[PDB]
Amino acid sequence: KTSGKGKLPPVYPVTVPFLGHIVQFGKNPLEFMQRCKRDLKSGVFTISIGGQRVTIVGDPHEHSRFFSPRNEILSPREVYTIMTPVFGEGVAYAAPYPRMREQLNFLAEELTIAKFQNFVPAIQHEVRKFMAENWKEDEGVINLLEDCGAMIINTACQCLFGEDLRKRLNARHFAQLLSKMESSLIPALLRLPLPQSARCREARAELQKILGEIIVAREKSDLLGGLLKAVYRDGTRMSLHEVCGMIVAAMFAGQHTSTITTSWSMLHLMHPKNKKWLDKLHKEIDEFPAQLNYDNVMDEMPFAERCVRESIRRDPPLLMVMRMVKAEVKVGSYVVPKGDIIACSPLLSHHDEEAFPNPRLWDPERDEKVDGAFIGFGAGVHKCIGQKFALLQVKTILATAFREYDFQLLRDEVPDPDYHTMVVGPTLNQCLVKYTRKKKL
Numbered sequence: 189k190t191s192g193k194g195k196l197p198p199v200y201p202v203t204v205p206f207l208g209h210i211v212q213f214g215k216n217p218l219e220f221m222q223r224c225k226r227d228l229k230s231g232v233f234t235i236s237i238g239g240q241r242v243t244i245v246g247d248p249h250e251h252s253r254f255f256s257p258r259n260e261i262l263s264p265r266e267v268y269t270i271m272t273p274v275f276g277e278g279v280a281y282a283a284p285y286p287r288m289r290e291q292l293n294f295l296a297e298e299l300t301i302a303k304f305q306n307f308v309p310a311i312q313h314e315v316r317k318f319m320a321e322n323w324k325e326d327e328g329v330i331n332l333l334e335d336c337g338a339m340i341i342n343t344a345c346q347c348l349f350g351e352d353l354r355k356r357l358n359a360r361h362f363a364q365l366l367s368k369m370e371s372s373l374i375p376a377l378l379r380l381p382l383p384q385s386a387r388c389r390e391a392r393a394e395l396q397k398i399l400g401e402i403i404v405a406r407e408k409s410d411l412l413g414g415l416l417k418a419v420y421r422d423g424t425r426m427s428l429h430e431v432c433g434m435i436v437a438a439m440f441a442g443q444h445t446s447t448i449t450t451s452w453s454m455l456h457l458m459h460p461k462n463k464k465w466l467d468k469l470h471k472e473i474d475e476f477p478a479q480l481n482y483d484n485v486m487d488e489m490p491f492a493e494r495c496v497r498e499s500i501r502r503d504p505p506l507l508m509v510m511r512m513v514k515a516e517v518k519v520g521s522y523v524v525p526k527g528d529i530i531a532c533s534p535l536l537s538h539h540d541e542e543a544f545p546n547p548r549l550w551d552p553e554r555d556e557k558v559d560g561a562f563i564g565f566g567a568g569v570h571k572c573i574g575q576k577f578a579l580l581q582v583k584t585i586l587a588t589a590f591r592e593y594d595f596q597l598l599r600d601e602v603p604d605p606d607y608h609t610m611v612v613g614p615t616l617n618q619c620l621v622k623y624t625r626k627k628k629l
């Protein structure tokens with residue numbers, strides 16, 4: 189059972205039992221969680237979605253307690269059921285953890301620092317190719333958020349998709365399918381049974397078929413190829429279904445998190461308030477040639493990476509990460525019982541006054557004042573596997589972009605975090621920016 193002296197973290201009083209806190213938690217979770225933490229004199233607290241127990245680890249010191257326990261204790265599968273139609277049955281979380289671990293490990297091996305051999309030139313190539321087309325005028329106005337999403341997807345494909353695949357699967361067209369597979373991840377039913385999404389099913393099968401054809405044609409380097417060579421610890425290869433899933437996951441995971449990190453970063457540096465930091469950025473990328481190489485970005489862009497880190501810290505794209513509690517776990521002084529859902533919020537954590545004084549301030553030179561406080565890319569057993577690539581990708585984009593362009597916000601102050609989904613980026617209708625082409629002669 190327990191048992192039986194299991195303590196329980198303070199519960200926040202709900203005005204409406206049936207409602208839960210959803211009405212508030214949606215409008216602005218930050219203020220809400222920040223309020224609970226303050227009033228309950230405890231960084232670790234439990235709130236209820238309607239008729240449900242949810243314990244939030246909002247104490248930076250306690251991140252270990254959340255990220256270190258293995259799936260057997262804290263299981264993510266139950267929470268992320270929703271994504272199964274997207275990743276597929278028996279893929280990722282949907283599958284048993286012994287297999288899941290393997291699947292991800294294979295994807296990881298494909299995004300390792302080892303594979304970045306030509307990635308940089310590939311990225312830099314696609315970026316310029318986009319700027320030339322969509323930013324013709326010497327001085328014009330565009331939407332940064334929409335444009336970063338395009339650069340990200342195009343860039344990623346140039347890296348992880350082979351010549352044959354790209355021509356067959358148009359880069360933009362892939363985002364078309366990717367977007368349809370999400371038309372079902374806009375919740376919006378939690379108490380009732382799960383319904384299938386026609387949009388998602390079709391778009392995935394449309395992608396799976398295409399991929400299927402390439403494999404046949406390929407049968408008389410890229411992520412897809414890398415995945416084919418894959419063999420399990422029992423002597424089994426990944427099926428088309430499983431391969432398609434991993435790729436979809438890789439692209440889904442990257443698209444939204446990176447396009448937001450890239451947007452936020454450009455937005456800060458862009459603001460006159462952050463002129464100083466823009467100067468030290470140019471100190472860094474001015475002496476670089478027009479053609480960047482792996483070394484330039486990986487080992488010669490330290491400040492640039494700091495900007496990206498701080499942008500992820502201040503406004504983490506991933507609101508919370510959650511897991512189903514199967515067994516008792518110790519958290520600080522308190523404890524969380526079986527059956528509950530334990531969450532951990534980068535957003536709340538990154539705003540702890542002790543760990544990040546003045547958390548709404550964008551300071552690329554700030555440091556964890558509590559070791560481990562930053563969980564932008566997760567931690568422990570579930571560390572992000574696309575981190576290294578995301579950074580290479582984002583840093584390279586920042587360079588090419590600020591190498592031959594100057595940007596100016598049309599708004600007064602940096603955009604507001606647009607909280608709706610678990611994924612949070614800058615407010616779309618505020619990401620309008622005027623670009624002016626740098627002087628040449």
Ligand code: HEM
Nearest residue numbers: 438441442445446509564565566569570571572573574578
């Ligand atoms: C800046 C961009 C990115 C951010 C901010 C980010 C953030 C995160 C976070 C917070 C987690 C923790 C998930 C959890 O605790 O449940 C995570 C895990 C993960 N990420 Fe990312 N990520 C990024 C890019 C990517 C990319 C590009 C990929 C694939 C290409 C990727 C693949 C994964 C996978 C497979 C996991 C879970 C694996 C595990 O549980 O060990 N991520 N990421």
Ligand SMILES: OC(Cn1cncn1)(Cn1cncn1)c1ccc(F)cc1F
Nearest residue numbers: 280437440441442445506508509572610
């Ligand atoms: O957990 C994510 C996506 N999901 C989790 N919370 C909200 N959506 C994070 N993802 C990883 N990097 C960026 N996003 C994930 C975990 C594993 C995975 F394979 C894909 C995937 F999106």
